[PDB]
Design a protein around this ligand. Structure first.
Ligand code: SF4
Lengths: 56, 216
């Protein structure tokens, strides 16, 4: 984006897709880096008093 | 041979044939010492029949329970190698080997002691596990390592420093120690922990809830 109106209109006319809304230059919806630190869950193991390895 | 069996052995011969089995039931029979210590009025030792009701044993020979009969919390027969008996079970059950096995507690030797409602039974049983840690050899890896874990876990349950998966894991280790040792001290270290988890589950839940509500 951040282009003037005339070349925008000629881009829209030379290819009739209304090209401005989706143009594949990523500006603001890049994922914000340095996310908060994650806590990862533990699935169907680690439960005490059933985890005999002879079962699974 | 034990000193009771040796000491009864001359009177069996010099007195009548099978007169000794005129006392009680048929299989488990005769006379036995009963040693009533703990929270009873005037704790002592007596001789009685093998078959005898527990309430008559406690009241009618050694004073009474301090504060009436209703004040008692639990009664351990046998001593330290026997799980505990709550009050509703010991309203009826007599003092025989097969009857206490039907109550799922192996009768030891005569140490029929009580503990009061106003006493931390978790603290008493944790000190009993500290007794087993002080007096046990270390041939077998199971009783050595298991008495280590059970003492640390019972200390943490006196302080209430865990979550109920830990008390279930205490049930798991007390299953795994029993029946895999040389001697009966490992099995004897596994039984009272089992009896505590069988009978006084919600008091442990209350202790750990109190510590959670205070630490949070
Ligand atoms: S189970 Fe018995 S024989 Fe084995 S190490 Fe423990 S006290 Fe010693």
């Amino acid at each position: 984006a951040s282009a003037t109106r005339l070349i925008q209109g000629l881009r829209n006319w030379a290819s009739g897709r209304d090209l401005q809304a989706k143009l594949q230059l990523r500006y603001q919806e890049i994922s914000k880096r340095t996310q908060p630190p994650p806590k990862l869950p533990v699935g169907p193991s680690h439960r005490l008093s059933n985890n005999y390895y002879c079962a699974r | 041979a034990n000193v009771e069996t040796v000491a009864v052995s001359p009177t069996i011969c010099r007195r009548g044939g099978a007169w000794f089995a005129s006392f009680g039931r048929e299989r488990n029979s005769g006379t036995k010492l009963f040693n009533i210590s703990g929270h009873v009025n005037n704790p002592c030792t007596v001789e009685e029949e093998m078959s005898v009701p527990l309430k008559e044993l406690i009241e009618k020979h050694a004073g009474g329970v301090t504060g009436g009969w209703d004040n008692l919390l639990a009664v351990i027969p046998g001593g330290s190698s026997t799980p505990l008996i709550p009050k509703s079970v010991c309203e009826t059950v007599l003092m025989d080997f097969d009857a206490l096995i039907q109550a799922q507690t192996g009768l030891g030797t005569a140490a029929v002691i009580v503990m009061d409602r106003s006493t931390d039974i978790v603290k008493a049983i944790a000190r009993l596990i500290e007794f087993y840690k002080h007096e046990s050899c270390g041939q077998c890896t199971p009783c050595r390592e298991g008495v280590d874990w059970m003492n640390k876990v019972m200390a943490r349950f006196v302080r209430g420093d865990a979550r109920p998966a830990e008390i279930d894991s205490l049930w798991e280790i007390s299953k795994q120690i029993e029946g895999h040792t040389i001697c009966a001290l490992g099995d004897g270290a596994a039984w009272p922990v089992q009896g505590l988890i069988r009978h006084f589950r919600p008091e442990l839940e209350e202790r750990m809830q109190r510590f959670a509500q205070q630490h949070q």
